Amino acid sequence: NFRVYYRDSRDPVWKGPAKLLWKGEGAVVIQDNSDIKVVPRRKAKII
Amino acid sequence: NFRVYYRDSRDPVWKGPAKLLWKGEGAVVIQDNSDIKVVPRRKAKII
Amino acid sequence: FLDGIDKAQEEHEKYHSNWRAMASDFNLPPVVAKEIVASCDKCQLKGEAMHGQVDCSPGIWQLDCTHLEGKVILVAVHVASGYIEAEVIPAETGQETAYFLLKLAGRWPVKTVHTDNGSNFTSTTVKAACWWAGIKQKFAIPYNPQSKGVIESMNKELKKIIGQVRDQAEHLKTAVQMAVFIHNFKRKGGIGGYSAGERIVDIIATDIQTKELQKQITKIQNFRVYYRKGPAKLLWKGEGAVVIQDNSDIKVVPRRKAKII
Amino acid sequence: LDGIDKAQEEHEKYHSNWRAMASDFNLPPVVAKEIVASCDKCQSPGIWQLDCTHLEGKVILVAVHVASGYIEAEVIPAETGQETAYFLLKLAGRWPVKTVHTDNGSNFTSTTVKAACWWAGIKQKFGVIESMNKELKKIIGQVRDQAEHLKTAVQMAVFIHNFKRKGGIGGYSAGERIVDIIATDIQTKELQKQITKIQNFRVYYRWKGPAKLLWKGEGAVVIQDNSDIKVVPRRKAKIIRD
Amino acid sequence: FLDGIDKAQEEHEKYHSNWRAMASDFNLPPVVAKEIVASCDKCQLKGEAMHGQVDCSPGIWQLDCTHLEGKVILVAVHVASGYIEAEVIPAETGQETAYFLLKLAGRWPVKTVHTDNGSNFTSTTVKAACWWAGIKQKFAIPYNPQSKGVIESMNKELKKIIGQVRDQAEHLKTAVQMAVFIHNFKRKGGIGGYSAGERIVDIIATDIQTKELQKQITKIQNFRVYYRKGPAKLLWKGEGAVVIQDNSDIKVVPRRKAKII
Amino acid sequence: LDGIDKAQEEHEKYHSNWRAMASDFNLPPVVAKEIVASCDKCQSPGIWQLDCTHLEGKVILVAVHVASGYIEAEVIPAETGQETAYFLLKLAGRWPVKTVHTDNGSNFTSTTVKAACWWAGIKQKFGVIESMNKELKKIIGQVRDQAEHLKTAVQMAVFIHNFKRKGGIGGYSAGERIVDIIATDIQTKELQKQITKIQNFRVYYRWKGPAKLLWKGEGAVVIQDNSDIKVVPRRKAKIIRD
Amino acid sequence: ELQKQITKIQNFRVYYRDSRDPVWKGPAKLLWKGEGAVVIQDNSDIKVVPRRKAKIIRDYGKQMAG
Amino acid sequence: ELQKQITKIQNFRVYYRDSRDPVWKGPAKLLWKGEGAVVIQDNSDIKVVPRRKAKIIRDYGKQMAG
DNA sequence: ACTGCTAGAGATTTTCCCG
DNA sequence: CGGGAAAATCTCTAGCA
DNA sequence: ACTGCTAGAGATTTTCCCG
DNA sequence: CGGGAAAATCTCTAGCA
Ligand SMILES: C[C@@H]1CCO[C@H]2Cn3cc(C(=O)NCc4ccc(F)cc4F)c(=O)c(O)c3C(=O)N12
Ligand SMILES: C[C@@H]1CCO[C@H]2Cn3cc(C(=O)NCc4ccc(F)cc4F)c(=O)c(O)c3C(=O)N12
Ligand SMILES: [Mg+2]
Ligand SMILES: [Mg+2]
Ligand SMILES: [Zn+2]
Ligand SMILES: [Zn+2]
Incomplete structure (x- = not known):
């Protein structure tokens, strides 16, 4: 499997x-x- | 001599x-x- | 490195050191330090450095709305050629977008439109219009203008030409149509050294011709x-x-x- | 190269045009053009027609590409020169419009329309349009029940006429026909440019x-x-x- | 091409066609069409596509102010090493900037500071402080953050580390100093695989040593x-x-x- | 390589340190280190001292690098543990602080200072400082007339002491001395790292x-x-x- | 017959x-x-x-230009 | 004498x-x-x-590493 | 299951043109 | 086969907001 | 008369290591 | 001299607001 870290939508965190x-x-x-x-x-x- | 066209300061024109x-x-x-x-x-x- | 790894994880909880610092200061191998960093959720703060590529099929159009002189301009670009279609509209309303898209479908073989998630483009009137015309709607990832960078760059080009020829017209609609004309037939470049009008005619004629010839070849x-x-x-x-x-x-x-x- | 004599014989026998020799005998278009122009015995994409039609108390401005039957129509608020000039400037921005045929109406002889045509490089000149108008009215009546407003039904009819109704020799729609005609015109212009250059x-x-x-x-x-x-x-x- | 040039200038007054379009449509040579475009003031809308390079001398510091959690942070970076100096200050006032710069001059051999044209940095108190310490002030071209892109990128780095370690502190000043420590001594990379503290010590020691040895060699x-x-x-x-x-x-x-x- | 025997003889004769053999005989520092460590008969950058001084009713927190005489001082609003911890955390963020010597004061034995030292990796331990304080007071009195507020005169005195006053063997200022000492420590740490790796x-x-x-x-x-x-x-x- | 069509293709x-190449x-x-x-x-x-x-x-330019 | 100093340089x-090169x-x-x-x-x-x-x-790393 | 791009300005490399 | 000039190609940026 | 940069994430190329 | 693995180098992006 994989881990994903993301920036989603107009949220810098x-x-x-x-x-x-x-x-x-x-x-x-x-x-x-x-x-x-x-x-x-x-x-x-x-x- | 030279001609210079420029964008100066926060003015898009x-x-x-x-x-x-x-x-x-x-x-x-x-x-x-x-x-x-x-x-x-x-x-x-x-x- | 059992002692070193423990002294590196304990330090990382305090400083969040990059892999090089812990490799240097605890004699760790690069893979071990990189593993220590990769297992820290507080240090996962950067995406991978590339870009995608937009769909360039002969049938896709990218649509967007832009604003000039307090008015709203609806713009469509045929992705494969750079040919644009723009029109001043009273407001960013699904009715205006639906009428504009019905026009475009009636003028060119529009198979798919790719827009952002503005309210006018996600309206039920626009969805009904696209269904009647057999247009597939693709919506961008929200707040990612890069998904329709073609129409964004076209907005930049159109505004530049409008600034160039604004004096020759009295109203913004006239100057917008003048800029559309200038971009479609008075600016050459690109793959074939074409104008956008010439390139779109070439693209569509090529698609028709290639489809017919390939059909005949596969039949024979x-x-x-x-x-x-x-x-x-x-x-x-x-x-x-x-x-x-x-x-x-x-x-x-x-x-x-x-x-x- | 070696087929120049064959092309000359073919022209002398069948009076074929340079397109045929270029496609068949593998010659550059300039050589075939000179072959076809060397015999004296062997001797449209830009013309649009504009007319105004009234339907249910609203004015519809119709433009027909003469060479193909492809249409551009829209409902305009009033039969005025400004709206005609806006429509013509839009059409010229979408298609290579060289000259427009008109019926000496009030809105077509206005100074605004003349100025717009001057800016667009269009020549104004004062039977196909009537038949096309009747066909457009028939399609509008067919699809009126599918649209609340008349302008939407007009655009739906334009779409149907340009891309759904098919007819003619090879059974192509008006959109395919206009695309082919404009592509042929582009080829003609490229050849003329090369001939002038050389x-x-x-x-x-x-x-x-x-x-x-x-x-x-x-x-x-x-x-x-x-x-x-x-x-x-x-x-x-x-x-x-x- | 006398007729062609006239028909191209007349068209350009209307459409402002690029050089390729007029070269193609009037049989003009590329140099002639490019000349026609270059003589149109309405078409001079793009600068040349490069970037400058900032001064990287061992004595130059780039200073800037940034804002976090409603507070103001004064940040200085030593350009040649990436070593930073940051401090929360009550307001962007020439007094605070003057005190900060006097501190920096008292701690490191600061020969020149390069800042933008904010009010605090152009104050007479700061000019008096730089004069007492023998610091040369270089001001950027107004509204060009690229002139001090080093301190701008350092602002980005400092804010990222502050976000990483904000929980460990209660106040913003403590977390800012913690981030300064982390950047100076806990993040390796760069030219020597150094930390910023190690790189600044290397740079300054090298300057002293090279100056002395070169003096001796030139004397002999x-x-x-x-x-x-x-x-x-x-x-x-x-x-x-x-x-x-x-x-x-x-x-x-x-x-x-x-x-x- | 060939000079290993020469280095061994030089060490046996003069008891030179590995820096000397490395610089002179062109040997890697590890080989010279082993040579200097092979003889039994031949057998500071991180230590700071903290003290509080009162001047004109205001408290000045002074930090002195013991090995060089370089100072870091500032006027703090109050003699409290929070201000001491802030000062120490700043100092550790600017310089490699390993251990600080203190005088068992109230502000140094506070829990805030201990926590700050724990985060910074500093060891707290409880004559140079008095002389340095007297010198700082003398320079502050000298340059007080050039500053309205006492903190500005304090920083001016720090600048003068670190970079303008010179003394010692080679006539270097305290800033050059601390830079040299920290560079030597960095070289020592790099050598220790390489030795541990190999x-x-x-x-x-x-x-x-x-x-x-x-x-x-x-x-x-x-x-x-x-x-x-x-x-x-x-x-x-x-x-x-x- | 077929060869003519293949030549026209x-x-x-x-x-x-390419997938990762933007030019x-x-x-x-x-x-x-x-x-x-x-x-x-x-x-x-x-x-x-x-x-x-x-x-x-x-x-088309190129075509018309041999 | 001089050769030692030149070697240390x-x-x-x-x-x-370079002027136009950013790396x-x-x-x-x-x-x-x-x-x-x-x-x-x-x-x-x-x-x-x-x-x-x-x-x-x-x-310094490299120096200490021959 | 989706996705940066475009056109213009300078710099550099290829190609054509007459020897 | 050899330089020059012209053309083609490549590199790189702002704005899209 | 002044001037984009940095650090991290992936991809690709060099180098080292034992045969 | 030959592959693999590891390391080094190169390419490329966001945010600085
Ligand atoms: C209210 C809808 C719904 C959701 O998002 C908002 C805000 N937004 C922002 C941009 C924009 O930021 N363009 C600058 C840009 C930045 C990067 C790049 F690669 C290309 C670029 F054009 C738009 O174009 C746009 O249409 C919208 C919009 O419509 N909306
Ligand atoms: C009131 C003073 C006086 C005049 O100018 C304003 C506004 N400004 C704007 C930025 C800024 O836009 N950074 C974004 C960014 C964009 C491009 C890039 F290459 C680097 C970058 F950091 C600053 O950093 C900054 O200090 C100021 C400022 O101070 N002032
Ligand atoms: Mg947009
Ligand atoms: Mg800034
Ligand atoms: Zn971490
Ligand atoms: Zn122009």
């Missing part, structure tokens, strides 16, 4: 770790506390 | 032509209507 | 190719290589170890 | 008299002398500007 | 060099080349065509 | 018994066997980790 | 990008076109490109 | 940039230091660098 669902070129689909988010890969770190 | 006085690496000293200005070379075009 | 050229497998479909052959499509997976193999039937 | 040179070969240049190839130079096309190697000829 | 090594000219001073010789200083102009010439006296 | 290896040469590694050069390997330093080619020896 | 030029690559020759992929030949090298990453055009 | 390493170049060897210029030797190539564009250090 980084959040995570979240579960990685889908990794595309440029964006990742994650799950954070039963919430599915789509983040650009610029604003995410996957471990 | 470009101004000129002005007289080139000094051309350094990164900045130019110009004269525009008896006013001497120092502009970064990012914000100036010299012809 | 019917063969099965065995390589290394199953009866792969033949796409292209020649120059010592064969291009095949096996189970909807296009792969390229050399002419050797392959036979065409 | 017509200012004079070539001396083997030295013989000056010859008009046709194609400056990578391995040969194609020239014309005494109403005849000859191929000479580049190293055996010199090209100068006059 | 005294020769005049003739090349191609006048009696040029000898700076360095060897490896087939000679470095000389003629009329305060340092140039490098090969060992050939040169004689040392 | 002391975990064992080398077999020509196979002979295990030998402690000294330097892994580009063209040779320096080892120690039976209290003797030998140079062997890299291809003639193997290095393993234990 | 190969007469088109494709501009394309558009030069006009490769078109060999095959699909719903989501195109097969090209760029400098004696055959690649398969997603349709969303490729711009296909017949550059 | 050449023991220092210089990081520097810092590697540790060249110091040959001469002046008020406004430094003379270095980067990969068998001698350059003169403005003092404002050069960072001069004796990297």
Whole structure:
């Protein structure tokens, strides 16, 4: 599995770790506390 | 001689032509209507 | 390094040192220090340094709203060519956006629109209009203008040209249409040294022509190719290589170890 | 290169146009153009038509590309010169409009429309439009029940006419037809530009008299002398500007 | 092209076409179209695409003020090493800036400060303080943060570390000093894989040592060099080349065509 | 490399330290360190001193680097533990502070100061300070007329003491002295780090018994066997980790 | 028949990008076109490109210029 | 005497940039230091660098490491 | 499951042109 | 095959707000 | 007459290490 | 001299507001 830390939406504070669902070129689909988010890969770190 | 067109200070509109006085690496000293200005070379075009 | 690792984790709880500092100050290997950093949630503060690439298919349009002189301008760009469509509208309302998009669909083969999540673009009127015209709506990741950087850069270009020709018109709508004309037919460059109008005509004509010719070729050229497998479909052959499509997976193999039937 | 004589014979036999020789015999378009222009016996994308139609007390301004039947129409608030000029300036910004045919109406002879056409580089000139208007009205009546406002039904009808209704020889819609016509015009303009660029040179070969240049190839130079096309190697000829 | 040029200037007054469009549409050479564009004041809207380089001398400090949690932080960075100095101050006042800069001058060999044109940095108290300490003030081009991008990037780094360690302190001043400590001694990298404290100590010790050794060498090594000219001073010789200083102009010439006296 | 015997003779004759052999005989610091540590007969940058001084009804907190005489002083609003902890945390953020000597005062034995020292990794321990305080007071009295407030005169005196007053053997100021001392400490720490990194290896040469590694050069390997330093080619020896 | 059509396909030029490369690559020759992929030949090298990453055009200038 | 001092000068390493180049170049060897210029030797190539564009250090790690 | 780009200004490299 | 000049290509930035 | 930078995350290239 | 692994180097971005 993977850990994802992300900056989501107009909020400078980084959040995570979240579960990685889908990794595309440029964006990742994650799950954070039963919430599915789509983040650009610029604003995410996957471990 | 040279013509200088520049963006000066928090004003999006470009101004000129002005007289080139000094051309350094990164900045130019110009004269525009008896006013001497120092502009970064990012914000100036010299012809 | 059991003692060193403990003295590095204890220090990291206080200072959050980067991997180099702990590697140097506790004689840790780079992998061990990097592991110590990677297991600290307080130090996960930077995304990876790249950019995505927008969809550039011949049917996608990027739409956005911009503001000039207190008015609202709705702008659409055909991504593949740079051809734009702009119009001053009374307010950022789903009705105005729906009318504009119905116009664009009636003028050009618009298959998909990619916009941000503004209220006008997510309205039920716009969704009904796109459904009637058979337009697929793609919405950007919220608060990511890079997702539609093409229409954003077009907004910059349009505003620059409007500033250039604002004196020649009296109203903003006239100058906006003048700037649209200038961008579409009076500015050359790009892939073909074209104007945007020429490039869009080339792109769409090419799509039609290539579709028809490929249809004819596939109708005539019917063969099965065995390589290394199953009866792969033949796409292209020649120059010592064969291009095949096996189970909807296009792969390229050399002419050797392959036979065409 | 070697097929120039074949192209000449083909033109003498069938009077084919330069497009055909260029596509078939693998010749540059300039050489085929000269072949087709060397015989005396062998001797639209910019024209739009504007008309105003009234429907349910509202004025609809219709523009038809004559060569294709493609339409651009919209409901305008009033039959005034300003609205006509705005519509024409929009159309010129979307399509290469060279000249517009009009019916000597009040809104078309206004000074605003003339100024807009002057800025846009359009020429104003004062049967297809009537048939197209009737077809547009029929489609509007068909799809009126699907739109509350008349302008939306007008745009839906424009979409249907341009991309859904098909007809003609090859069964293409008006949008495909206008795209093909504009692409052909672009090719014609590119060829004219290349001919103008290369017509200012004079070539001396083997030295013989000056010859008009046709194609400056990578391995040969194609020239014309005494109403005849000859191929000479580049190293055996010199090209100068006059 | 006399007719073509006139039809291109007349079009440019209307559309402001780029050079490619007029070259294509009027058969103009690229130089002629570029000249037509260059003579239009309405089309001079873009500066050249590069960046300058800040002064990195061992004596220059870049100072700035930043804001966090409603408080004001005065920050100074030694440009050559990345070593920072930060302190929470009650207000952006020339008195606070003067006291801070007097402190910095009393702690490190501060020869020149480079700041923006904020009111506190242009105050007469700060000018009097810099005069007493022998500090040269360089002011940036107004509204160009790139002139002090080093201290701007340091503001970003300091705020990130403050966010990392804010819980460990109760007040902002304590956390700011903790972040200063962390940046100076707990983060390695850069030219020498150093911390900022180690790098600043290395830089200043190197400057002192090199100055002394060069003074001794110039006192001992005294020769005049003739090349191609006048009696040029000898700076360095060897490896087939000679470095000389003629009329305060340092140039490098090969060992050939040169004689040392 | 070839000068190892010369360095050994020099140490046996003059008891020189590894810095001298490294600078003179062109040896890596590890080899010279082993040479200087191989003889039994041949056998400060982090210590600061804190004191509180009262001047004109205001409390001045003075920190003196013991090894150099360099000072850091400032006027604090009150003689309290919080202000002392803030001052010490600032000092540790500016200089490598390892341990501070104090006079068992109320503000130094506070829990806040102890917590700050714990976070900063400083050790608290409870004649130079008195002389330095007198010198600081003299300079403050000298330059008081040039400053309205006492804190500004204090900082001016600190500047004068650190960079203008000079004295000692080579006539350097306190700032140059502290810079030299900290640079020497950094070199010492780097050498200790390298020694710790390389002391975990064992080398077999020509196979002979295990030998402690000294330097892994580009063209040779320096080892120690039976209290003797030998140079062997890299291809003639193997290095393993234990 | 078929050869003519294949030649007309190969007469088109494709501009394309790679997944991690932001600069558009030069006009490769078109060999095959699909719903989501195109097969090209760029400098004696055959690649398969997603349709969303490729711009296909017949550059009319060049055509008219041999 | 003089040779010792020259060797100590050449023991220092210089990081520097060029007028139009934003990435810092590697540790060249110091040959001469002046008020406004430094003379270095980067990969068998001698350059003169403005003092404002050069960072001069004796990297202690490396020194202590031979 | 989605995704920076564009056009203009300078600098540098290739190509063409006559020898 | 050799330089110059012209053209093409590459590098890099602001603004999109 | 002055001037973007920094540090961290991934990708790619060099170097070292034992054969 | 040959691969693998580790290390070094290079490329690239956000935030500084
Ligand atoms: C209320 C809706 C819904 C949600 O988001 C807001 C705010 N916003 C902000 C920008 C913008 O910040 N452009 C500057 C920029 C920055 C980076 C880049 F790569 C490209 C760029 F254009 C827009 O363009 C835009 O349309 C909106 C918008 O519409 N909304
Ligand atoms: C009232 C004074 C006087 C005149 O100017 C204003 C406004 N200003 C603006 C920034 C700022 O915009 N930083 C963002 C940023 C953008 C680009 C970049 F390369 C680096 C960057 F940090 C400052 O840092 C700053 O100190 C000021 C300031 O002080 N003042
Ligand atoms: Mg936008
Ligand atoms: Mg700032
Ligand atoms: Zn951490
Ligand atoms: Zn213009």
